[PDB]
């Protein structure tokens, strides 16, 4: 429960927008820095942060392409930025890079990886907690540009530090702060290019519970798709109000509980928090059970692997009224379901 304890994707990292017919995650140099400052927390705090000892939540907008409960490991996804090329007359004057002819940013395919420059523990992780938010960040390649920005050589924080580290890491290919010809130039705008991203989750034989993150922006939301691979455990999943790409690969004796309380009612967002409205009358009209598929409302759950008596019965659950927990018990084998109240 406590779908209210969990923040909305983008609360910390920021939500990208369209300002001039272009996706822009940040628009002021100062503010760009803070984002990096934010990104850097994966080193400082770790991959996962704990909400109240109970819920493991990945860092906001941290691209994770794999969670493996067998290895206790994760794999980071693509987080790159456009490389520079062709400075002339470079010096280091007063800790600030100087140039006669300023370097040019370019979209040409060799891109620099931000994540590579990061020191993160992605192995021997502590995934003991039963409660875990699924990642909310798709693969991206940041465009950017600089602009003449006086008086920001004073700027120093975990953000400027990471930015500096990227410069040093990719010698003569990245300069976020520099003086050229007349005045000081700084990266002013972060312009992401999100990409289709399949997050893979390899499950152990334990009991695990997953909350789909609430991602309001539709565009970003639909770049993601989760692929679960069960191995004979007990798996719980709270769907968001949003129809998300979910594929479940079935192992022998896989028991799946899918909370659909966000599917069967209208859900809105009021003060940057979920707001559960009234149950859709004739919600069962929207329920379609096909061979290796559950369609409820417009949400889709695809199924792969061996379907039999050990793993064919998946339990969709929500609350028909305040104090009535209903279970839609779907039989994948016979494309039939039934209705209980416990």
């Amino acid at each position, epitope marked *: 429960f406590s779908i209210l304890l969990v923040p909305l994707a983008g609360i910390s990292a920021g939500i990208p927008s369209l300002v001039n017919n272009e996706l822009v995650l940040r628009d002021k140099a100062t503010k760009v820095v803070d984002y990096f400052k934010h990104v850097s927390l994966v080193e400082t705090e770790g991959v996962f942060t704990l909400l109240d000892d109970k819920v493991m939540m990945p860092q906001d907008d941290l691209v994770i392409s794999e969670i493996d409960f067998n290895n206790n490991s994760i794999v980071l996804g693509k987080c790159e930025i456009w490389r520079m090329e062709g400075g002339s007359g470079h010096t280091v004057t007063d800790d600030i890079d100087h140039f006669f002819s300023a370097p040019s940013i370019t979209y040409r395919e060799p891109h620099l990886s931000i994540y590579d420059v990061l020191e993160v523990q992605k192995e021997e992780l502590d995934l003991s907690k039963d409660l875990m938010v699924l990642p909310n960040a798709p693969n991206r390649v940041f465009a950017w540009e600089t602009g003449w920005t006086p008086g920001l050589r004073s700027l120093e924080n975990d953000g400027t530090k990471l930015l500096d580290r990227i410069r040093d890491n990719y010698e003569g290919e990245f300069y976020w702060r520099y003086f050229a010809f007349i005045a000081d130039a700084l990266i002013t705008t972060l312009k992401p290019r999100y990409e289709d991203t399949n997050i893979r989750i390899n499950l152990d034989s334990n009991t695990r519970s997953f909350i789909v993150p609430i991602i309001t922006t*539709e565009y970003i939301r639909e770049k993601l798709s989760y692929s679960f691979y069960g191995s004979g455990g007990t798996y719980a999943l709270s769907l968001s109000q949003y129809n998300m790409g979910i594929n479940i690969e079935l192992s022998e004796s896989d028991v799946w509980i899918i909370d659909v309380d966000n599917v069967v009612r209208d859900v809105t967002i009021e003060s940057d928090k979920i707001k559960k409205g009234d149950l859709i009358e004739g919600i069962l009209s929207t329920l379609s059970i096909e061979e290796n598929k559950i369609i409820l409302n417009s949400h889709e759950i695809n199924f792969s692997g061996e379907v039999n008596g050990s793993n064919g019965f998946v339990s969709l659950t929500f609350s028909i009224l305040e104090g009535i927990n209903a279970i839609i018990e779907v039989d994948l084998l016979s494309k039939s379901y039934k209705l209980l109240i416990s």
Partner: nanobody
Amino acid sequence: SQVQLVESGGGLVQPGGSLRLSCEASGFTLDYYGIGWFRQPPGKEREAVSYISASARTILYADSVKGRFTISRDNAKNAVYLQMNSLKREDTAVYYCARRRFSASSVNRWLADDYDVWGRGTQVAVSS
């Protein structure tokens, strides 16, 4: 005049017929925006018809047109399409194309406050 959503292809057909509506999205990049189709029958409210999300993955139709209408979009050629089949007389309306705001955090997806650009509509009448 920059950002527009011009619809075309409306006219007259006879019950059980079919036609195809066109939306020439102009003056922005609709690879980001989700597009909807709405309609207003004579003397009635504006009505939800179909709604394609940016990138497919969310093709929704109103119960009145399920099975009959089919929605499609060519981001590349910046146009959305609605193929209409088995046209009944109840389908007589003024059909509109509209772009869903990029930031719409509502599952309704037809809320009409979540839409920023609206076309002029094309009328469809159905009578033999």
